[PDB]
Write a protein that binds this ligand. Structure first.
Ligand SMILES: Cc1cc2nc3c(=O)[nH]c(=O)nc-3n(C[C@H](O)[C@H](O)[C@H](O)COP(=O)(O)O)c2cc1C
Ligand SMILES: Cc1cc2nc3c(=O)[nH]c(=O)nc-3n(C[C@H](O)[C@H](O)[C@H](O)COP(=O)(O)O)c2cc1C
Lengths: 106, 105
């Protein structure tokens, strides 16, 4: 089952919702992630260039797919097949971002 | 500001998240809508053919936009410019639906 994260569009994209699978994958409870930028999932072995591509895509409200090394709450590394897309109204205003997170470590 | 509604993909698409604007537009608090299908927003004068188009789009996980007559908690009618899109993982599985609700009254 794939994780889903919803963030606000503006002001450093704080998490506003995660599904159950997000907790299964990351080991974080909703309480522990709400109001935070998802970048806490990253650590020392996370690829800087991949993070840069995410940063620029989100700034431009551009859909992006990346395979990124993330870390469970307990510090265990896992490979995150991450898909982020802006949510737009019909006037093109960005209302939110949605992230789909799949553990592809195996 | 535009409302946003997130539902589960399966089992009659219960609401799992709404943003602030959803409450401003509909007059419903999150606690009142969570776990419910969004069809409660429809009323007597809602166009049946529009509802049928939404029903078929969701069944096939197809993106759809409709202008649909909805009703606030207090019963006042409003025109809802509604856009629904499936949220998919990289293997095409539908993880959720996202609806954007703009009051165009
Ligand atoms: C909806 C959403 C979900 C995200 N999910 C993840 C994730 O699961 N793992 C991750 O490393 N980064 C994720 N990010 C990316 C970070 O929040 C951040 O945008 C990224 O690290 C680049 O920005 P920064 O250089 O300011 O940290 C997500 C971003 C958004 C908007
Ligand atoms: C994410 C999402 C948001 C929705 N938002 C609305 C809405 O704001 N107003 C509305 O009348 N129907 C909305 N619907 C549609 C109803 O939930 C339902 O799909 C529609 O009435 C057709 O199915 P039915 O014939 O089983 O009711 C939404 C559906 C989804 C999946």
């Amino acid at each position: 089952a794939s994780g889903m994260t919803v963030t606000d569009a503006g002001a450093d994209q704080p998490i506003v919702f995660v599904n159950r699978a997000f907790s299964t994958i990351t080991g974080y409870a909703p309480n522990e992630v709400l109001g935070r930028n998802a970048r806490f999932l990253q650590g020392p072995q996370t690829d800087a260039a991949t993070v840069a591509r995410l940063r620029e895509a989100i700034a431009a409200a551009r859909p992006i797919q990346e395979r990124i090394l993330n870390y469970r709450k307990d510090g265990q590394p896992f490979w995150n097949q991450l898909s982020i897309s802006p949510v737009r109204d019909e006037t093109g205003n960005v209302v939110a971002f949605v992230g789909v997170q799949t553990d592809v470590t195996a």
